[PDB]
Design an enzyme around this catalytic site. Sequence first.
Site, PDB file in Angstrom:
ATOM      1  N   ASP A  93       1.553 -28.990 -48.975  1.00  0.00           N
ATOM      2  CA  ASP A  93       2.270 -29.036 -50.237  1.00  0.00           C
ATOM      3  C   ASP A  93       1.434 -29.667 -51.349  1.00  0.00           C
ATOM      4  O   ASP A  93       1.345 -30.888 -51.445  1.00  0.00           O
ATOM      5  CB  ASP A  93       3.556 -29.846 -50.037  1.00  0.00           C
ATOM      6  CG  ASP A  93       4.425 -29.879 -51.275  1.00  0.00           C
ATOM      7  OD1 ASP A  93       4.126 -29.153 -52.246  1.00  0.00           O
ATOM      8  OD2 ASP A  93       5.418 -30.639 -51.252  1.00  0.00           O
ATOM      9  N   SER A 116      -1.660 -21.986 -68.206  1.00  0.00           N
ATOM     10  CA  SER A 116      -1.898 -20.553 -68.185  1.00  0.00           C
ATOM     11  C   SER A 116      -1.978 -20.058 -69.618  1.00  0.00           C
ATOM     12  O   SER A 116      -1.334 -20.606 -70.527  1.00  0.00           O
ATOM     13  CB  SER A 116      -0.776 -19.833 -67.415  1.00  0.00           C
ATOM     14  OG  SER A 116      -0.868 -18.427 -67.537  1.00  0.00           O
TER      15      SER A 116
HETATM   16  N1  LIG Z   1      11.485 -29.755 -54.724  1.00  0.00           N
HETATM   17  C1  LIG Z   1      10.421 -29.589 -54.347  1.00  0.00           C
HETATM   18  C2  LIG Z   1       9.076 -29.364 -53.946  1.00  0.00           C
HETATM   19  C3  LIG Z   1       8.009 -29.162 -54.835  1.00  0.00           C
HETATM   20  N2  LIG Z   1       8.026 -29.055 -56.160  1.00  0.00           N
HETATM   21  N3  LIG Z   1       6.940 -29.063 -54.035  1.00  0.00           N
HETATM   22  N4  LIG Z   1       7.212 -29.172 -52.686  1.00  0.00           N
HETATM   23  C4  LIG Z   1       8.512 -29.362 -52.640  1.00  0.00           C
HETATM   24  N5  LIG Z   1       9.089 -29.546 -51.406  1.00  0.00           N
HETATM   25  C5  LIG Z   1      10.538 -29.696 -51.194  1.00  0.00           C
HETATM   26  C6  LIG Z   1      10.711 -29.461 -49.702  1.00  0.00           C
HETATM   27  C7  LIG Z   1       9.421 -29.801 -49.080  1.00  0.00           C
HETATM   28  C8  LIG Z   1       8.337 -29.631 -50.145  1.00  0.00           C
END
Ligand SMILES: N#Cc1c(N)n[nH]c1N1CCCC1
Length: 330
Positions: free
Chosen positions: A35, A199
């Site tokens: 992430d 962008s």
């Molecule tokens: N809201 C949100 C989010 C984000 N902007 N990036 N990763 C997120 N996750 C939520 C669940 C796990 C990772």
Amino acid sequence: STGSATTTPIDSLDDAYITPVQIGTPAQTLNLDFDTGSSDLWVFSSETTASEVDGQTIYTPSKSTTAKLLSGATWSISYGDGSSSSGDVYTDTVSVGGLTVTGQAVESAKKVSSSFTEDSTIDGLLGLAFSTLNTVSPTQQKTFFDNAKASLDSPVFTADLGYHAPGTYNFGFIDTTAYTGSITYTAVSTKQGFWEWTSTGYAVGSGTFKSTSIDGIADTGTTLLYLPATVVSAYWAQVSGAKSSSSVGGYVFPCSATLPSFTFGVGSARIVIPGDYIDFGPISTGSSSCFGGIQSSAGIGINIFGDVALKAAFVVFNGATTPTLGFASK
Ligand SMILES: N#Cc1c(N)n[nH]c1N1CCCC1
Ligand SMILES: N#Cc1c(N)n[nH]c1N1CCCC1
């Protein structure tokens, strides 16, 4: 050093991607959601409330000879979408695709919200945003990338997400066989802790390109593409029968439709998202209303270049002293 790991969609819609990660000694392999929009490496564990575990693989620190409790440390994260998790912290050895970090903070969940429990395929998160967002208290911890960076051949990682197919996360090198043409690099602001960039505009289908600055974040942990309401309205206006449904929670369209592509600008370059990538299927089983992959960011406070956008590109997260982002077609 370098590392290379395959990342795999969790389901037929590419709702998220999981990447195997080795934790501890002997290794415990968990499938984590990489992430670039958050900065905590947290896992389902032997400490997770039993009723909140439903099929996930858990990390058991007592079975790892290299695990050490990080005394007094706790963590608690509330994601923008309302999901959350919290617990305590160990340090341990973490390897991704052959790249090993010793003393990585591995945040062990005591509690997770229902959305995490309900996703049996995701064993935790591996955050790749800037370490300034890490939630460990009272001593903030570094991400896996930040810990690895000095040892890497080059201080970079790349995301190459597949459309309905596996892809790759590489650390420490740029695979010049994985993209077409050139990589266009663009400036990043780290002021909010994200891979935040601007962008240069967009086009809908075969329409003319509109030059306009759109500030947003490159966020592998978000499924969809969230853009300003003006841009999103212009997109869905080209799909007969498309509408925004407050009851469903965004734009839906007839499943019989053929969706137009969506192009976004990166400097003078252009990344084209094929129409098929914007189809997230029936809103409920058997429905002829389908959920759109481009949605308004109006209720969010930031634009988000999530998986729908990123999977159309080979993306370089350059963690040099002044970070930048690179995008190539593929
Ligand atoms: N809201 C949100 C989010 C984000 N902007 N990036 N990763 C997120 N996750 C939520 C669940 C796990 C990772
Ligand atoms: N229906 C509908 C709808 C709405 N409530 N806001 N924007 C809409 N669209 C933008 C162009 C297609 C429809």
